[PDB]
Symmetry: D2
Subunit: 162 residues, 4 copies
């Protein structure tokens, strides 16, 4: 069974370009390590980039969508859930590790839900407020990474322990 | 329609004793103001206290629960969802305002989801990091409350808007 | 607690005129028997008629809806779920009995899901194939009703058990 | 994008052996055609068999589960949904075609939901009552198949038209 790595980030308009770069590179390295990328299939911000990156590097991608899937070609496997744009809905109970790249309400909710699920989360491109808050929720499950390499190292290690 | 006030908070193990007392007092004040209380229908920290409070004050309560069968007399309208408890689903898109008493991963998810749905949230007895962080996600929708009465005043303001 | 009676049925386009009249009459009788009506809160065939009926008879209604914002005055307790409308989610695990008036794919799914959850379902104005088929899934939980009063009698029997 | 074929059937105790055979063979032929099998990952009746079949024949499998995934090794990609054993919950909005093998409450619900989603469904090993009822819901979307070959022909054709 290939490890499944989750990526979550804000959608287009509330995303710094450094985060799209970080997302795509992470994408790359997720695929490069032989891991499946699981992310939203909605083809906009951080997630689309991760998917482009994973797919470019030969990786298998999974794109979660809610409804009538009109979905980047970076997606290999669309999981259409039927639920809302409330999330974010919530299959990163499927990932071995979750990586957040940036932050916003949707991402915060999925990070919390993964902590609640006792899954480890790597926080990349988030701000002090987020890092501290999430580390306060579960210091044992939250890993702050300075950059993509750091994020990928955190993941590799968490996988080695499993 | 009576306003529906959503209450979120941690469970038995993770609710502090001061947070129980506040959740109970908040429940009471929700009822005394003529509002319906919506909260988790199985969960025994904050949510049970809130509901027990609303009820003692003669309030009407809606309890959201993931399924059968593990319900409290304190719950009037039991809504069984047949999703899981991966999410505290209570459902505060049903609510006019959401009040988080205390904090933890489940609560943090529901506060973040309300905000994502552009709903105001009142934060009571959440620590400084919760308050600063949620404020960082959406400063116009997050209201920090010092104590039950402040939380009630925030709720009233949001309702009168 | 008042019994909660779940009503399922097709939407505006697919509800026959006789089925509107029955759904309205069923709503009325749900209310007159002191039960709460639970049904879809956005859907304008059977479910709207049922709710309009309960309401005219002074009944209390719970409307389940997928989201904001597209609600009827006929709905007292609006429950917004923030799932989709891939499923009529109304939620009849919340209900004591489920009544399907008329039939179609959405209705068929909710009737099958109630049965899966070992809940009794009363089938009203569903055609012979619906009745025979659901009966084939679980004969002890499926009750065919000839008309509103028979459906009400079935419901009463299930409640008295 | 590989076509995703959905399979649904009753779980263990309410399943004739002819249906487990039919399920496994269908599984086989789904994989043999280069299609992804999407089914419940719960490792018991019709679905487990389909998965064993798909995996034996080199196919990629997707196993939907609700909760804390304690999940046959026939699953490649577990999608953990977080929802109930209410379903059945309900990602066969992801399949191009759905195949029911046998029938029971859970299966009936997913067939209906797929008809509601305007997706085509092939009914294999079901009884007259089911065939007629579902054909009455949407005659244009429901295909009754006498056997696995027939089921697989129905699918191939529906895919050709898409």
């Amino acid at each position: 069974r290939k490890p499944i790595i989750g990526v979550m980030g804000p959608g287009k308009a509330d995303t710094a370009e450094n985060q799209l770069v970080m997302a795509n590179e992470l994408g790359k390295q997720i695929a490069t390590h032989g891991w499946i990328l699981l992310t939203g299939g909605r083809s906009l911000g951080v997630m689309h980039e991760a998917m482009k990156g994973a797919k470019e590097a030969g990786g298998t991608t999974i794109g979660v969508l809610p409804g009538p899937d009109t979905i980047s070609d970076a997606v290999d496997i669309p999981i259409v859930t039927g639920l809302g744009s409330a999330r974010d809905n919530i299959n990163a109970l499927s990932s071995n590790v979750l990586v957040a790249v940036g932050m916003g309400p949707g991402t915060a909710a999925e990070v919390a839900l993964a902590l609640k699920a006792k899954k480890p989360v790597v926080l990349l491109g988030t701000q002090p407020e987020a890092e501290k808050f999430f580390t306060s929720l579960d210091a044992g499950l939250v890993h702050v990474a300075a950059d993509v390499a750091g994020a990928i190292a955190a993941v590799k290690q968490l996988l080695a322990k499993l």
